[PDB]
Paper text:
Here, we carried out a deeper characterization of FC-531, studying its interaction with CA IX and evaluating its anti-tumor potential in parallel with [name]-0111. In vitro, FC-531 displayed high inhibition potencies for the transmembrane and tumor-associated isoforms CA IX and CA XII (i.e. KIs = 6.2 nM and 2.3 nM, respectively), in line with those obtained for the reference compound [name]-0111 (i.e. KIs = 45.1 nM and 4.5 nM, respectively). The binding mode of FC-531 was assessed in complex with hCAs II and IX by means of X-ray crystallography. Superposition of the 2 structures clearly showed an almost complete matching of the ligand bindings, the main differences in binding interactions being spotted at the upper part of the enzymatic cleft being the Phe131 residue mainly responsible for pushing the inhibitor away with beneficial effects for the key interaction among the ligand ureidic oxygen with the Val131 residue.
Residue numbers in the entry: 1 to 125, 127 to 261
The structure:
């Protein structure tokens, strides 16, 4: 609540700049996507999402989200095309969500907040490892996908099923043989802009690719997210909800759209 960065009144996003002054930088994320200002760019290529050989490893409650990690030693699950130059390897995905269904997303669309947001995090292979990539202005690409409540997303259910085994900070479980293709919406139409990580260290090295089409997840799926805990085992129970950073100033940036 004050012993480490987080999302509460005493350690949340308004405090982060003290340890990470780039929090007040020129290319911070998330942002509000004003759909009427975004520019259709007919020269953007279709996004290429190649996840058929993805090799998942573990699922972890890291005290700020839950995250599924992948083997990124080789080009297995990669993102290419769109605004990207070269090849970006999938490292991990995680979510941000709310306490109620009208908040939880980091990006907004014409100020609209979604119930949650999925981030599929990739790094640029030209830098050899993620640690080096994190120091570059084009080191990372994050594919952001909004979640709204509707019918269940079948490809999310194996994630939901394991959450009770990682309730508290520091717990992990085996999470091999998970196929992230099951998390995507039908359309790959997107907005893109240059930004940052949305958690410390807030590094300004991300090409954001935010899909226009949300996925629908069921009420029961989101309720299971909201049973996770921020705290470690034995500490006062603080439900892991509202683990989202609000929109940051756009400053000197243009958001581009892949679609008219
Ligand atoms: N919310 S967001 O999508 O903007 C976002 C925020 C923070 C990160 N940070 C990392 O993935 N860091 C990282 C992972 C993994 C490793 C490894 F263990 F592999 F070296 C070393 C660093 C990514 C994305
Ligand atoms: Cl604390
Ligand atoms: Zn994220």
């Amino acid at each position: 609540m004050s012993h480490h960065w987080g999302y509460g009144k005493h350690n949340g996003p308004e405090h982060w700049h003290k340890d990470f002054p780039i929090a007040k930088g020129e290319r911070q994320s998330p942002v509000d996507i004003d759909t009427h200002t975004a520019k259709y760019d007919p020269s953007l290529k279709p996004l290429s999402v190649s996840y058929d050989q993805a090799t998942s490893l573990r699922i972890l409650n890291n005290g700020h989200s839950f995250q599924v990690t992948f083997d990124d030693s080789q080009d297995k699950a990669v993102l290419k095309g769109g605004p990207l130059d070269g090849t970006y390897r999938l490292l991990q995905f995680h979510f941000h969500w709310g306490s109620l269904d009208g908040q939880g997303s980091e990006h907004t669309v014409d100020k609209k907040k979604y119930a949650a947001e999925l981030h599929l995090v990739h790094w640029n292979t030209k830098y050899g490892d993620v640690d080096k990539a994190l120091q570059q202005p084009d080191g990372l690409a994050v594919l952001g996908i909004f979640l709204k409540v509707g019918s269940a997303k079948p490809g999310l259910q194996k994630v939901v099923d394991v959450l009770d085994s990682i309730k508290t900070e520091g717990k992990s479980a085996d999470f091999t043989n998970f196929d992230p293709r099951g998390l995507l919406p039908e359309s790959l139409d997107y907005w893109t802009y240059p930004g940052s990580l949305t958690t410390p260290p807030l590094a300004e090295g991300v090409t954001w690719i935010v899909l226009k089409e949300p996925i629908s997840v069921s009420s029961e799926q989101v309720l299971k997210f909201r049973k996770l805990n921020f705290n470690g085992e034995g500490e006062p129970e603080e439900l892991m909800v509202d683990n989202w950073r609000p929109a940051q100033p756009l400053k000197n940036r243009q958001i581009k759209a892949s679609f008219k």
